[PDB]
Amino acid sequence: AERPPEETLSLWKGEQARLKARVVDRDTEAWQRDPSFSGLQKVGGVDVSFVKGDSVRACASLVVLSYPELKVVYEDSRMVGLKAPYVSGFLAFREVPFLVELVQRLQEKEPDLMPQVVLVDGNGVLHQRGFGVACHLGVLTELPCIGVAKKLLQVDGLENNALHKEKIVLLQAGGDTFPLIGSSGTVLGMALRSHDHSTKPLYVSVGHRISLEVAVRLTHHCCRFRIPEPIRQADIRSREYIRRTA
Ligand SMILES: [Ca+2]
Ligand SMILES: [Ca+2]
């Protein structure tokens, strides 16, 4: 609706600190250590689309794609009732309850299509408190998650200034990257040029149960276009669903 009170934001900050202790930022799946991701068969994607004049109605979508073919083998799109407004740094408290429900519906409907990793539209550890939406989803479902954002969250000294734009120019081909280094000296994520015919990078960060280098490489392998195909197909299908109900 409208901006939540400081009371709520405080509880939200506190919940993010509690759950962060459960993030695993290294590889835990055998396919992640494989040079060609052998053993990876199913990649998930999630998105939530909203309506222009409607602050309460949204559409949440979960897709599972075959890998490496990137063919949609499962789709579930759902109209939902929004509770929280969008506040930067608290994106999870607006969308993640609906995404968790989608995962549980998949487990009940098609348990053999449970994805081995989820691409999440939004950051993971690249976040004001080191616990973005992709970490939040990963910890609540225990699935490996990757954060993929289209704009750079300005945290820990990260800035979309002239130097940052110089480096983006230096990205020349799909798969090129440069690291996002915080003022503490830690690597929060990578800027990734996802396709040869696109210049605007993706900003990839660890969600849960994956390393950054594997996350970046897998993100690149899913990009038929600029947006990785799992996120792209959830975006397309959730928006089409809004359109038919409007
Ligand atoms: Ca989204
Ligand atoms: Ca979207």
UniProtKB/Swiss-Prot annotation:
Top-level division of the source organism's lineage: Eukaryota
Enzyme class comes to: hydrolase
- State where it is primarily located: cytoplasm
Q: In which tissues is it expressed?
A: Highest levels detected in liver with high levels also found in heart, kidney and testis. Expressed at low levels in brain.
Summarize where Mg(2+) binds, as residue positions.
47, 121
Give GO MF terms, alphabetically.
Answer: DNA binding; endodeoxyribonuclease activity, producing 5'-phosphomonoesters; magnesium ion binding; RNA endonuclease activity, producing 5'-phosphomonoesters; single-stranded RNA binding
Q: Gene Ontology cellular component?
A: cytoplasm; cytoplasmic stress granule; nucleolus
What biological processes does GO assign it?
DNA repair
Which cofactors are named for this entry?
Mg(2+)
Keyword set, alphabetical order: Cytoplasm, DNA-binding, Endonuclease, Hydrolase, Magnesium, Metal-binding, Nuclease, Nucleus, RNA-binding
What's the EC number here? 3.1.26.-
User: Where in or outside the cell is it found?
Assistant: Cytoplasm; Nucleus, Nucleolus; Cytoplasm, Stress granule
Q: Where is this site: Interaction with target DNA?
A: 86
> What function is annotated for this protein?
Endoribonuclease that specifically cleaves inosine-containing RNAs: cleaves RNA at the second phosphodiester bond 3' to inosine. Active against both single-stranded and double-stranded RNAs. Has strong preference for single-stranded RNAs (ssRNAs) toward double-stranded RNAs (dsRNAs). Cleaves mRNAs and tRNAs containing inosine. Also able to cleave structure-specific dsRNA substrates containing the specific sites 5'-IIUI-3' and 5'-UIUU-3'.
Q: How does it assemble?
A: Monomer. Interacts with PABPC1; the interaction is RNA-dependent and stimulates ENDOV activity.
Q: According to its UniProt record, which protein family does this protein belong to?
A: Belongs to the endonuclease V family.
Q: What is this protein called?
A: Endonuclease V
Query: What organism is the protein native to?
Result: Mus musculus (Mouse)
What is the taxonomic lineage of the source species? Eukaryota, Metazoa, Chordata, Craniata, Vertebrata
**What gene does the UniProt entry assign to this protein?**
Endov
